[PDB]
Amino acid sequence: NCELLATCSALGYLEGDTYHKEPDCLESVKDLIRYLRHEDETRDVRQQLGAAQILQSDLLPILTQHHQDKPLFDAVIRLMVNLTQPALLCFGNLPKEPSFRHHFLQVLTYLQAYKEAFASEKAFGVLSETLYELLQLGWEERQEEDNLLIERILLLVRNILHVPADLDQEKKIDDDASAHDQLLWAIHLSGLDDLLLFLASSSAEEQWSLHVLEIVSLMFRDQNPEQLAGVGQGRLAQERSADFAELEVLRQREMAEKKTRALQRGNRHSRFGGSYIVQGLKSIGERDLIFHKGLHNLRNYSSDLGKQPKKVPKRRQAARELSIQRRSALNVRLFLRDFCSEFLENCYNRLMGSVKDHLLREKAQQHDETYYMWALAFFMAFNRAASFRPGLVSETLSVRTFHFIEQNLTNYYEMMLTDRKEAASWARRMHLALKAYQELLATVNEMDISPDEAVRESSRIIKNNIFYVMEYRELFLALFRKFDERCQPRSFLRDLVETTHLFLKMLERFCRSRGNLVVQSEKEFNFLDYLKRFACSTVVRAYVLLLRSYQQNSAHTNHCIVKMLHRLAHDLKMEALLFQLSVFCLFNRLLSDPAAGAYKELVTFAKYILGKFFALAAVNQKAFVELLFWKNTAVVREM
Amino acid sequence: NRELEALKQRFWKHANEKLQVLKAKLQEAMKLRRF
Amino acid sequence: IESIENLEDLKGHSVREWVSMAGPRLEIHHRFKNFLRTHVDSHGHNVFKERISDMCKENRESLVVNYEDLAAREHVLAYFLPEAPAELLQIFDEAALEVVLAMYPKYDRITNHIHVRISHLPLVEELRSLRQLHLNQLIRTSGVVTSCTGVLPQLSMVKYNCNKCNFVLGPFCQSQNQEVKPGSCPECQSAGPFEVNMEETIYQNYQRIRIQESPGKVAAGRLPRSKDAILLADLVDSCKPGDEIELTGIYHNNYDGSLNTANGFPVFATVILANHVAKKDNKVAVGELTDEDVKMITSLSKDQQIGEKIFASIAPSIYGHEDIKRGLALALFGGEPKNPGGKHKVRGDINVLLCGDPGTAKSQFLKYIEKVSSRAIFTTGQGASAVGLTAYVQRHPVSREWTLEAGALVLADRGVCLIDEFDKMNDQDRTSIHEAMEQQSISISKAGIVTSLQARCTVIAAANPIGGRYDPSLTFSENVDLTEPIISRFDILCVVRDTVDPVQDEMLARFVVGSHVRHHPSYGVEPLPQEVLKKYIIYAKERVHPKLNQMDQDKVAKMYSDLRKESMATGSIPITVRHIESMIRMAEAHARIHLRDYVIEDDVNMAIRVMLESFIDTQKFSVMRSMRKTFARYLSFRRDNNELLLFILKQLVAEQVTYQRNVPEKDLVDKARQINIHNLSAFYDSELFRMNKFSHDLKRKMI
């Protein structure tokens, strides 16, 4: 510790706003790099230098005020890349035991401190200036001296963008400048964003395509494409009025719930006694039920009034969504909208072609196709949002991208089912693949709507290819029949249901418009026998699982759920599959909802199926027993 | 307002939390040391 | 560990951890060692060599550092000191021990730790103004000590015997926060009823005081705020209940479940960890006097007009009243207590009574004595009680056993009790002070307590005559309304009158208006500065002790005999036997004023003059002149004797001329020592040789 303190002191000192470097900075920095290279597996030197805050106190001032001293600048850049190395790379994984996890948290804390320090525009200004005067030279004029410096500069930017938000300070409310927002603003004011656009659009500097893709991914980490595309000049009044209206809506909901609870309990204090015998209700024994919880509770009596819920065991605990969404700063949102627009118009086709070339040549790291699929989803969604132009994404519209995404999704599906010790990670990768697939399937619909007969022709071509090949049809059933709430989040379930709805919409409209009978060595096909594959218990079980959150679901998601269930019930006559006790409890909640008028479609469907059930029950009383279990072909025996 | 200002001057003539003040006025001396 | 060239760049740390780590710790250590070794005052004298030498002379284990000097000499240490006081005070103690053992290699036999105390810290705070912002910072506060525990032993590094085996648990440090629980024995893992090893345990002195806002700084009708303070090691018994103190210490907080359940909120108890206690009474102690101070005092004593200077320095803003200034100077310096044979105690303190007219500066004299004297108690008339003056018994505030408590006379035991409006007191309150005035003790027999306390104070009282106007038609006894037992207990008895006299009125008016000019917010002999006078007084009282060899018993005996005769004749004042002992006390006081180790006839003649002039002052108008000529012709107002030295000089000159015709100053002073006329400086200032055309020079010694 003390030897590190000595070298850290030997770096120099700050005075007011000017840093006075010692002449032995070079050897002291080399010694620091040597200590970091000879670290323990606990990363003790990492923790100690982070605690000493030399990155904030010495290296940033040296970088910002002595950037003409090129050997010292290069040494400082290498040292800063080493220090800003992400914790997952430092330790290899998230440790499973307390001591290494404490060390991981320490390194992560100091990384968050570095990210806080790096929001200064001066540092990114120096980085942009040195990268600019480097890239001014021709590619053939570069040597290892400059190519390695480009690598270290871009890796420093990547490392600083990668850092997770502190759990302490991630409680920022919407429309506020988080640390990531301030960092993006630093990039914007320094002009490194324009250098990233240049690197993406350059044919000569295509060697950095994977790096630039990772920078752009970490830049647009938090954003949503349609929400970002909706940003514009008049947003302040819109968002202010929306905030006031949403505040009043929340308040009215809370007042309604308070009034309902005040009615459920009486207007007498709890120690006001009184006991009743409910003569008809047998207790757990043969004696009549004695009720003690007040007369007010017997209007909506239930036996679970006083019961403690059960501990879901660790294995059965459902997966939860990893982050809340927050509306970032308006300046940063405008900057990211402009970045995304200019990038889409000037850079996107060449960058995606370069990344696909890298993946084909197999000179990319293990999971860089996840970044490729992210970029597909984000930028095609942004393109369709606002002024849709398929020329801006025509490199992505090929059937080869459908094939690549389908292969990746099936690979992630297999690896999720087999590599069980990181099944959640494989599920997240599969979620990225699913969103990319969804955006392709949405883009062909937008091509159909668009007026150009050329894009309509190619839309017909790709639709014919996809609906002809079997895997695109079978993948949805494959996903539904092995989806697990234990592993995959409800956001994934939402995306799967909406993608299935869109896919069946397109397929039904296609077959309705024209026959096109042969499919898959070909065989005949029809959409009704395809839909009969969705009559399995598991898929409808997943659909009602998503339906349980109808209060929190989006209106489009609720429409997708109810339309699929209405297709299975009304058009395929499979109401006995959906005659279930848990589903009936959900219908009971739907009918008892005070906001049931807001869910007119759902309650109407519920009353339709309930009326069918009670007709069957009046005809035959064994339907009550049939409610208790999921079924296979009892769906026809009941009929 | 010159006579009013003169009255202000006469009243100023008869006119006749601290850790931060201490640290600042000492910070000046250590800055001079470093220079 | 490389030397750190800049401590000031914290590099993102806070001061506490920054100075806790080794590099800055060693740098602070070396900087404080260098400061102690090389700091010099405005005269170039190395102050800390002198201070450490005095500390090692007196075995005091504690070193006071002036924060002003630290801030001037070494800035960053003064910067970090109030921010992280515990850490830097520990480092300072280590460095001070290194310097002390460099100066005195064998001082480890006397101490094992040197406590660095900080004084004159500018971070002064009112007790009512302490906030959470001051926590764990070095603060400075003022207040009156209202409670004190006894000096109690506290564990500092405690060792425990194991409850089963013979092993002893390691040294555990006591924290002031909670009881230290030993844990489990590492030899055998037992955790049962452990017990302290008294012989191997290290203890420290502990004393918990309660201070509150001083009653003159609190608002009227408002209740005072108070703080607990912990005094450790040689800070114990730095103060007693009633003392006004300045307290420098660390403002410290810890969790208290009792306060939490009292308030319903997680309120933390607070206490001051005292670093330096300074009584606002004793701004200068005898230990504070430097070699410069004592050199000033001793050289100033050699002026040979110092008695007039000291008299003139008593209340320099009061015109006239030379007899009052003389009496107050004699009382302020004081005599010597004596106990011949161990069986007959006689007081050494001189008591003074200023009786007279309104608007004659009696109260101003009393307030001057209050301001100048250490251990001054001021009280007034009906505001005093017998019980409050002497001593009082109360239920103890927490434990409720009867306990005796110190009154004003006990609290002034080696100081001054000032009683304004003395005639306005109740008789029952005024009779309480008889034992303290003469026997210098207060004996209480109340509620099972039977004991005598020391009350060796000097009483200076102010009074009015009957009707508020002194009457020269009557004697003092006829217009005072006090009785003989209390009148006789006052050694010096002064009458101050406000009679019309136009020239004196004009001079007094000019002096008063000049004083009001001089003191705006902005006799002949010249006085001392009051700071110098205070230093001179404490040196004269504590470092000097007069001893009486002879006093020419016949003179004083005859004086007392016929003073008794005239007192019996006129009835003006009882004389008893106390006036004789007052003569001895006043002679010792004048010797102390001159810093004499032995009393002489100069002092005896001074005391004689004071007694005779005051007794004459007690008389009526017509009687006063006859008494003046009586005691002046027969008894000793020995103003001067120039004629003997004059004719000795003339004889020596005549003999020398006769010898030379057909070193005189050495010849003159030789004859002046042979004859009992040794005070020759008076002759050299007088006119009698000058108009006879003689002269003197201490260098040439020709006359």
Added chain:
DNA sequence: TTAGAGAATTGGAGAGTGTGTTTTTTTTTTTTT
């Protein structure tokens, strides 16, 4: 494609250990009597 037999992990019943508790009188003192 469902589900059932054998092995391993997690829930919680309960056995064991340690902690906390059940108006009255005499005397002083200041002010007021």
